């Protein structure tokens, strides 16, 4: 009954317009396969957009926006029909004028448009959606907040290219409050948004720090649900990607005891992200490496370096190798790493690993060796103890076998250590 539905929609009678719009909303809201393409064929999308103009009755606005929400929920080609019909500035208007119902429907539509592509994401922001969107969070209706946070998250989302920072950074105070929510769905989505915004240069990380988000992030690391832990950990990880001062904020927020638990996670991505996070802290200064050591994080890292799945194992390698570079400033770091049995798993890694990891592992081994030589002069001795361990663990041959590597950086390094310590 599409041609008669369409005729009803073009009627000048308001009551018939509403009836038709409801009918369209219903078939686009049905359980199985909505006929989005067929509805577009009817050419009713421009008309549906007309029903969102400011002097239309609220109910017509609501129903029309719902229909346009679902048309925009399909393929990019179908979302394009909605966008090309200039629906988006009208969606944004409704965020101001509408009832809570209309607001929630309009922010839903905007979410679908934004989630389609980086171009459409950016288009929504160019239409100045951020201001009325932020306004929605002064509401106390859970479902409006929930939906809006999802839309806000879609706006923050993406890297190729990232969105306008001058715009999305305005949502940070809202997001800071939103991660205190008791609504799990709102929580999850706000953490995701924050994880997106925290992936960037010094100024982005600082902005996230300045609204005191890190403290709450570290708290959420011990949330019951991995749906919360994952994006929270991703954001936390992103922050310690920053300079030593910014990383210290996260440490002071108690991230280290929190990471201790995450190292045991059944969710491999959490284990891996935890190792990655730690590696960026052991990439910090000597006190920050020391802090990782004091937190008793090295034995779980060494076990993971030993037996975890390769991707996770790689990250553990970085954390331990990075920690070893603090050995020049204080030798006790190397002493401790070696007593925790890091040498054999480092050496064993030299075979199966890719060139990037090989270089990192060689660096780690050379740090262990440098300290070991210095610990001969410093206490009159004939043999480098760490060179012995490496030989006993079979690493000597494995380092030697690295000389047959296509990569010149790896070769020179493997050669230099073979001839200096062996």
């Amino acid at each position: 009954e599409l041609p008669q539905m369409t005729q009803q929609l073009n009627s000048d009678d308001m009551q018939e317009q509403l009836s038709a719009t409801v009918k369209f909303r219903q078939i686009l809201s049905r359980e199985h396969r909505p006929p989005i393409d067929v509805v577009i064929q009817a050419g009713v999308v421009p008309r549906l957009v007309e029903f969102m103009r400011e002097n239309q009755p609220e109910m017509l606005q609501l129903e029309a926006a719902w229909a346009l929400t679902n048309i925009a929920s399909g393929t990019s080609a179908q979302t394009k029909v909605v966008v090309d019909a200039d629906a988006v500035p009208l969606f944004i208007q409704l965020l101001y004028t509408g009832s809570v119902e209309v607001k929630e429907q309009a922010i839903w539509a905007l979410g679908n448009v934004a989630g389609d592509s980086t171009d459409y994401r950016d288009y929504v922001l160019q239409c100045n959606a951020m201001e009325p969107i932020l306004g929605l969070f002064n509401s106390n209706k859970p479902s409006l907040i929930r939906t809006a946070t999802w839309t806000l998250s879609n706006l923050c989302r993406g890297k190729k290219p990232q969105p306008d920072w001058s715009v999305v950074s305005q949502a940070l105070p809202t997001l800071a409050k939103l991660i205190y929510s008791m609504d799990t769905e709102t929580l999850v989505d706000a953490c995701w948004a924050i994880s997106y915004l925290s992936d960037g240069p010094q100024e982005a990380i600082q902005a996230v720090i300045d609204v005191r988000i890190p403290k709450r992030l570290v708290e959420l690391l011990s949330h019951e649900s991995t749906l919360v832990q994952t994006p929270a950990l991703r954001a936390v990880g992103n922050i310690v990607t920053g300079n030593d001062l910014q990383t210290q904020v996260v440490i002071n927020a108690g991230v280290l005891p929190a990471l201790r638990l995450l190292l045991s996670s059944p969710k491999e991505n959490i284990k891996k992200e935890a190792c990655w996070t730690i590696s960026n802290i052991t990439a910090g200064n000597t006190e920050q490496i020391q802090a990782v050591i004091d937190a008793n994080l090295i034995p779980p890292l060494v076990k993971l370096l030993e037996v975890a799945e390769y991707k996770t194992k790689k990250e553990a390698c970085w954390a331990i190798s990075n920690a070893s570079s603090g050995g020049l400033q204080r030798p006790d770091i190397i002493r401790y790493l070696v007593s925790q049995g890091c040498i054999k798993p480092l050496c064993d890694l030299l075979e199966i690993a890719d060139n990037r990891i090989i270089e990192v592992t060689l660096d780690a081994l050379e740090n262990i060796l440098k300290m070991g030589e210095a610990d001969k002069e410093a206490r009159g001795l004939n043999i480098n103890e760490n060179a012995d361990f490496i030989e006993k663990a079979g690493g000597m041959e494995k380092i030697f076998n690295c000389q047959q590597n296509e990569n010149d950086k790896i070769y020179e390094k493997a050669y230099k250590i073979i001839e200096t310590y062996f």
């Binding site: 809201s29 049905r30 359980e31 909505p34 719902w66 929400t69 679902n70 925009a72 929920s73 399909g74 429907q105 839903w108 979410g111 679908n112 989630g115 389609d116 999802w150 998250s153 879609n154 989302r157 890297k159 999850v188 989505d189 995701w192 992936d199 994952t230 991703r234 990880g237 992103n238 990607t241 920053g242 991505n269 891996k272 992200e273 990655w276 590696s279 960026n280 052991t282 990439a283 991707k311 790689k314 990250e315 970085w318 190798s321 990075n322 570079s325």
Partner: protein, 35 residues
Amino acid sequence: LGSTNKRKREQISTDNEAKMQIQEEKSPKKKRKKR
């Protein structure tokens, strides 16, 4: 040396076909409102 060992998210959190799909795990880009 003295070079930084800080690794941003893309050059690290090391990669696989699957992991980038699965922990795509992100809230779904589009939703459709039902009855």
